[PDB]
Structure formats: structure tokens, C-alpha cells
A paper describes a structure:
Scabin has been cloned, expressed, and purified, and shown to harbor dual enzymatic activities (GH and ADP-ribosyltransferase). Scabin shares nearly 40% sequence identity with the Pierisin family of mARTs.
According to our Scabin-NAD+-DNA model, Tyr129 is important for binding DNA, based on its location and orientation in the complex. Our model suggests that Tyr129 reaches into the DNA minor groove and contacts both the DNA I and II strands. Several replacements at Tyr129 were made to ascertain the chemical nature of the Scabin-DNA interaction. Trp128 and Tyr129 interact with adjacent nucleotides to the guanine nucleophile, allowing Trp155 to dock to the target guanine base.
Numbering used by the authors: 36 to 200
Write the structure that this text describes.
Amino acid sequence: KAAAPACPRFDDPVHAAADPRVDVERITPDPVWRTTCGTLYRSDSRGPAVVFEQGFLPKDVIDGQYDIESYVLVNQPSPYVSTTYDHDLYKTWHKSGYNYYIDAPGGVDVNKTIGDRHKWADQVEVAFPGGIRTEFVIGVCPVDKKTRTEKMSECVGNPHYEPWH
């Protein structure tokens, strides 16, 4: 094989945002940004026809919960779209229909920002302020709820995905 190259470093930490109205200075605590560029994942019940068209939009960039600890622990409407480093986290999700694959720069590394002591540290989450544009959504695999497995013959690539590294 070969050894992997480092990742491109973007100047804007929310370059990936689907809603650029997000206010980075409102993020608390001081965010530790993800600097790796491996695939990330999101369990979502929303279908690819919607996600491939819109990307992942956050619930409320205006008056949503900008405190990452509060958002992780109680999940009010927020400027964030959560993803995970863990390909298999979909297996822990009740009924969410799809495992989305994401290739996006940046995001707030939740455990590096609020520590790995908290209740949901096992989710190894990356929270995207402003969400995630469709160009950074690779594709999706539907999940068979009864076996908690991906239906790999039914995965779909996002025609809008734009490789960048």
C-alpha cells in the first residue's frame, strides 16, 4: 500500500455548513475542531431524496442551543448536525432508517471539547455547526431494523458528492 497523506486544512471552520448563518462565536465551550478527514456517519430517518437535495440542515441556527454540552445531554433544537466517527453506531439507534456516509471538513469534536467523561462519550460525536452541505454527503445505506445491519445492495451514492482530498 502506501502511508496516508495529512488532510487539507480549511481556513473557515464551518466551510461545510449548509446554513452559513451559524454564529461560530456563540459556540460554547471553546470548540476543539476536528482536523482529520476520514469518513463520518449519521443515522437519520430522513430519506436520501431529501438529504441529497438539501444536505443536512440544522434545526435552529438563530435561537437554537449553542452550548455543546447542553445539546448533547438534552438535544433541544440547535445549530448543530451530529455525526459520528463510528461506522457501526447505527446499530445502537432505534428505528432510524439510514446510515449516511459523510466526507466533510471540520466539525466540532465533541469528546475533545467537553471531555470523554460524559454520558454519551461512547457516541464519539462530531457536531457540525450550520449543518453539512450535500457536496459533503457521500451516500447512504438503508438499515434493516430487525437485524441492525446495512442493506448493502440498496446503498446509494449522492450524485452531488464532490471529492476534495
